[PDB]
Design a binder for this molecule. Structure first.
Ligand SMILES: COc1cc([C@@H](O)[C@H](CO)c2ccc(O)c(OC)c2)ccc1O
Ligand SMILES: COc1cc([C@@H](O)[C@H](CO)c2ccc(O)c(OC)c2)ccc1O
Ligand SMILES: COc1cc([C@@H](O)[C@H](CO)c2ccc(O)c(OC)c2)ccc1O
Lengths: 242, 242, 242
């Protein structure tokens, strides 16, 4: 009666506190990922993943440490630094990370997270001779993440990092006058040395900016939850004919 | 003596843990609000509010689900998507949300929150024929929020969302060469179908960029609190005559 | 046996909860710092510091309330507002603050924090006559913070704020065509009225954009920790010869 209560409260607290630590830990993975990719440090990125982890980029799946090192190292690091750990003279790749919404499973062994990034990228004039031809000298980019996390032996890791690029703009023209200089993946590893292990099913392939596709929310409506229905609200607005 | 202590500690913890959950929940409302308005989904936004909730935009009060659906649906959704739930081809409305400072009431039934947003907005050339005339093709905007929250039947909701736009810049000219294309609200609903239920008192009406007005901090100085006084520090600097 | 357990759990919880409060409190210092510097309010900034606190700007150390008021007041406030507490007509100085990674000491009396800022800055045409000559009318800037915190009489304060500017871009040309208009500090107070008390050792002086230098991470690899080694991952990528 007296003790059963004290027990109850300590179980209810340990559960709530673990959850609060879990949210901190999972956000911490995404922010750390950001600081590493800003420095073209593919080794630190690879280490964030479970050994069966997957990263998705331009609708291509890169599998395990090897696939992550292939995306961030073989492709990105050679593209931006010619294969040096950054940062390096004149090379900007700032992926500002924000707006985390993390949903931890009730059992505390898996989670989802929505995040986004805005990238300021480019070669200063002093290092412009190092830039490849198929890339603007300076650009903006933004993307959404809907990631999966696994608590593996009590340690939060990235199960699935799914970066969906939403738009790019050349600094000089902006998003309104710029077509994405990246297209859905076509050729897999090993045919393509920069390529993914697998391409997503045909239906799920994202065409790039200006094309848009909904990235569905991993998180439930945070007030109405499962009780939220669009059609309970739509009738209150008026649709106009132009 | 022994048990009274154990009780004390469990009361002191349950209080601290609830607070930590409350901060997470309130930030979660603002970040969720962001993802919905990026998609021109006024129904999800309306659902975040208490039924006597208020949103303030350009010094106009929109009251309840109806008023929120009138701002985000009748006005914004028709303006940006011609009345479709987004996202849609070529239409960018990314309101990057950050820098939350949340102050929960001691009793845990109300809160305040300061937040801000920076908006990258526009129509790609491919959908430029859908853009209304009174709006730049592509622009930056930023604003501050000082919001009120109500824990209504143990559930955090928006009592008052007060977006105060601070500046806009056409992508091509930037903030320094751009006058706000939005002005303080003048005409109320029902006269104006896009209009607010009420306009703020005359004294409180904000003129727009380049005009600036302080948005006072909802949060106390986080080191000195109520002990903070400006005039204890001012004498240490030197004012210069130009 | 029964009670020793209950004790154990309450000690283990009080420790975990204090940590969660500490992370909130330390982030809160950086976000509050942001809102104050956006308003050219050097008094609120000074109050965030321990009395032996230090701020580092362009490789110069400003010591104590006086040194902070000298940086943010005597220098910055006169430069941007001619010595008025902001905000003021036509003057933009929005330092968007994000991507906090906080590491609290095991004993809970000191912490480190990595953060970053992106600054949208400038004078509208209407106040362009107030701008000094050595500054672009409108610009972007970004920087990294690796700060130290001290829990002084149970109250979190800034021990060391170390802003390392990473890049600037004139709005009209962007980061790729812009050299930093700020250089490493050369002349100390009192010779220089805007100058720092001390300049960092010669070795540690940062040259500015386009020059880049690593800002080492205050935080351990958040999955592998001390077990993380670069050379365990590098062999998995391929270095390419161009
Ligand atoms: C897969 O995770 C991410 C990928 C990106 C991309 O936007 C990268 C930047 O690192 C990229 C941008 C422009 C390019 O032209 C490019 O060429 C291959 C690559 C950003 C953030 C991620 O999390
Ligand atoms: C009221 O909440 C918000 C309002 C805004 C506005 O800046 C919106 C964007 O949704 C807006 C921008 C430019 C326009 O020309 C416009 O025409 C009506 C509307 C942003 C964030 C908010 O939280
Ligand atoms: C030391 O803390 C910070 C310093 C800055 C600087 O970028 C400031 C803006 O306040 C600055 C920018 C441009 C200038 O030309 C300038 O002249 C002295 C100063 C930003 C954030 C900080 O935390």
């Amino acid at each position: 009666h007296m003790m059963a209560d004290v027990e109850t409260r300590l179980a209810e607290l340990e559960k709530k506190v673990q959850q609060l630590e879990d949210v901190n830990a999972i956000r911490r993975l995404q922010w750390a990922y950001g600081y590493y990719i800003d420095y073209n440090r593919p080794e630190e990125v690879a280490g964030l993943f479970a050994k069966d982890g997957v990263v998705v980029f331009l609708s291509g799946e890169y599998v395990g440490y090897e696939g992550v090192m292939r995306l961030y190292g073989t492709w990105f690091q050679n593209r931006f630094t010619g294969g040096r750990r950054g940062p390096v003279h004149g090379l900007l790749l700032d992926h500002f990370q924000l707006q985390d919404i993390i949903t931890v499973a009730e059992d505390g062994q898996t989670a989802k997270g929505r995040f986004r990034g805005i990238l300021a990228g480019g070669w200063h004039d002093e290092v412009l001779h190092e830039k490849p031809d198929e890339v603007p000298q300076q650009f903006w980019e933004s993307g959404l993440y809907e990631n999966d996390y696994v608590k593996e032996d009590g340690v939060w890791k990235i199960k699935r990092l799914d970066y969906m690029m939403q738009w790019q703009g050349d600094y000089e023209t902006g998003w309104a006058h710029t077509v994405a200089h990246l297209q859905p993946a076509l050729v897999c590893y090993p045919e393509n040395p920069d390529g993914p292990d697998r391409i997503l099913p045909q239906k799920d392939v994202r065409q790039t900016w200006p094309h848009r596709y909904e990235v569905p929310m991993s998180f439930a409506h945070p007030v109405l939850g499962k009780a939220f229905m669009v059609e309970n609200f739509t009738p209150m607005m008026m649709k106009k004919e132009k």
